[PDB]
């Protein structure tokens, strides 16, 4: 019962080779360089998936700190009213009222500036 290889490594190289599309040069055509990239593409695909949340937060702090500053208070003054006043509403995902429609976010500034003491 001789079991030669035959089809299974051609299918296995087609899975990695057709999984690795759009790469520079021999790491999209050759099979020994396609799996050396998809390992790093998987590790970068994990770590940058962990980094997307924190990077979007680092965008949200710049949008909130950018929008609140011209009212006469910065970010550290702004959050101190929210954590103490029981008005934890914004929660840094609600920057789209500081961007889209600021006539109510300005009222959130009015609720936050009176909560300094």
């Amino acid at each position: 019962p001789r079991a030669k290889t035959g089809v299974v490594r051609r299918r296995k190289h087609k899975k990695i080779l057709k999984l690795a599309k759009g790469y520079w040069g021999l790491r999209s055509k050759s099979f020994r360089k396609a799996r050396e990239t998809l390992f790093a593409a998987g590790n970068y695909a994990y770590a940058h998936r962990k980094r997307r949340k924190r990077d979007f937060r680092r965008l949200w702090i710049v949008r909130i700190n950018a929008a609140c500053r011209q009212h006469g208070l910065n970010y550290s003054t702004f959050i101190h009213g929210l954590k103490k006043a029981g008005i934890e509403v914004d929660r840094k995902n609600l920057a789209d009222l500081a961007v889209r429609e600021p006539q109510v976010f300005a009222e959130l500034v009015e609720r936050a500036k009176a909560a300094q003491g």
Binding site: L38, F39, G42, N43, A45, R49, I87, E88, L94, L97
Partner: protein, 101 residues
């Protein structure tokens, strides 16, 4: 009449049209469950409490569909450790009728 509903830890700026996806609820696909905690009424109403205490939304779900396939792959250099794991996160899609209260 927009709002900020909270479910599954996440919050959403919701309109009476429709919204994006939320956590996998224990909701029948023809039934209508209530999303309890909201914020920030639409026209001239604004709140200063974590819960509105008087207004909420009641939203009908559509169904447990099938999303995309996020494929994670652990790899460590010169440890001889190669892991290839598939993962699909479930979702429940739901509309909005009105925000009463």
């Amino acid at each position: 009449m927009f709002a900020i509903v909270k479910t599954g830890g996440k919050q959403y700026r919701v309109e009476p049209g429709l919204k994006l996806r939320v956590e996998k609820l224990d909701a029948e696909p023809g039934a209508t469950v209530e999303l309890p905690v909201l914020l920030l009424g639409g026209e001239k109403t604004v709140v200063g409490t974590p819960v509105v205490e008087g207004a909420s939304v009641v939203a009908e779900v559509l169904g447990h569909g099938r999303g995309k396939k996020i494929l994670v792959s652990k790899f460590k250099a010169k440890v001889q450790y190669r892991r290839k794991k598939g993962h699909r996160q479930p979702y429940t899609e739901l509309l909005i009728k009105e925000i009463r209260g």
